[PDB]
Paper text:
Expression of the putative acr on a plasmid in a CR1-immunized S. thermophilus strain completely abolished immunity against the [name]-sensitive virulent phage D5842 (green), and even eliminated the residual resistance observed against phage D1811 (red). This new Acr, which bears no similarity to any Acr characterized to date, was named [name]. All [name] and AcrIIA5 orthologs completely restored the plaquing efficiency of phages targeted by the CR1 system of S. thermophilus, indicating they are blocking the activity of St1Cas9. AcrIIA6s did not impede SpCas9, while AcrIIA2 and AcrIIA4 exhibited only a partial inhibition.
Each monomer consists of eight α-helices and four β-strands forming a β-sheet, with the sequence topology α1α2α3α4α5α6α7β1β2β3β4α8. The superimposition of the [name] HTH dimer onto the C.Esp1396I-dsDNA complex brings the [name] helix 3 into contact with the two major grooves of the dsDNA. Helix 3 exhibits strong electropositivity, a feature observed in dsDNA binding helices, including the one from C.Esp1396I. The dimerization interface is largely conserved as are the DNA-interacting arms of the HTH motif. For [name], we chose an ortholog (92% ID) from the reference phage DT139 whose host, SMQ-301, also contains both CR1 and CR3 systems.
Residue numbers in the entry:
A (entry chain A): 1 to 183
B (entry chain B): 1 to 158, 165 to 183
The structure:
Amino acid sequence: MKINDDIKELILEYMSRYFKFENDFYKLPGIKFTDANWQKFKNGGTDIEKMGAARVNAMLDCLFDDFELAMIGKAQTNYYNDNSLKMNMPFYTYYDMFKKQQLLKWLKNNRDDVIGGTGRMYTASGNYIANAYLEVALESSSLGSGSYMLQMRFKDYSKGQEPIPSGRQNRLEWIENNLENIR
Amino acid sequence: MKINDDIKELILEYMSRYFKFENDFYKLPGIKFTDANWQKFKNGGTDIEKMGAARVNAMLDCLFDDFELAMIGKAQTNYYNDNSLKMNMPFYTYYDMFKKQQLLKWLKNNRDDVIGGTGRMYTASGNYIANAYLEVALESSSLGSGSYMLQMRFKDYSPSGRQNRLEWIENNLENIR
């Protein structure tokens, strides 16, 4: 893992995916940007490398599962050592591809260990964004109390938007039928 | 995860495990402390929360595999929500326990997939500390070019072949942290 402009672009990309209103994110405890400093951050006026470590890691902690933070670091290693990848796509897009390949690996090795659920997002005003993402985990990686060592987040980007069913088998089949629609 | 004093204590603990001489670590590119500022950092004079994000994450990147960085964050969630854990032990100690329990899980449920090898550490003077740690990974998690999605590091405080090195790990569970 390396903090740089690719990570700033990744944060801003994922912030826009989960948060309809930017202030629901940038006013969060641990992040707490003023309206002016937020705009400065979005527009390239603030070097993420020199920003406070707690603030940068709080933005990452909000947007990504801890396992996704490991995937970001592993994706960076692949990206910075592959000239074809750097030539063709920005880092955040490569990360989505790395993450999708991890899900394909889970589905291939043991589809029956793949579980999921709807994820919500806490806002600065003390409310929640319903259906912010689809949370996917390997059941065997359970850490107890709804925690999992291997866990990921996806967003449904289809026009069709096939309703995500509640029920273990129906959800696994939904995932398998919407692989091209989730990012 | 969360950057706080528990992480500063964790960095200092792991730095002491892998680096015989402190300057081999704190003078590294991307970390680059002066002798005076390192002393200030070491004895609570520098707030890690306010330090540069790239510097803090470079210290973490050196000391931990990216999968271990995920384990730190998951361990923090368990630790901050369990009053018995906070009462009895500091965070870094709990993290070693969380990590050890992850290894036991791999040995129990993914035994035929457990691979290992010697890890080396790059120093500020441009050389390598050859047997810095035992590297343990799940072969099926391979990312190509010696990279693995699921990978951990252990320090031995006390062998050729896959099932053999596996038996060494199983016989030295109490000797590694």
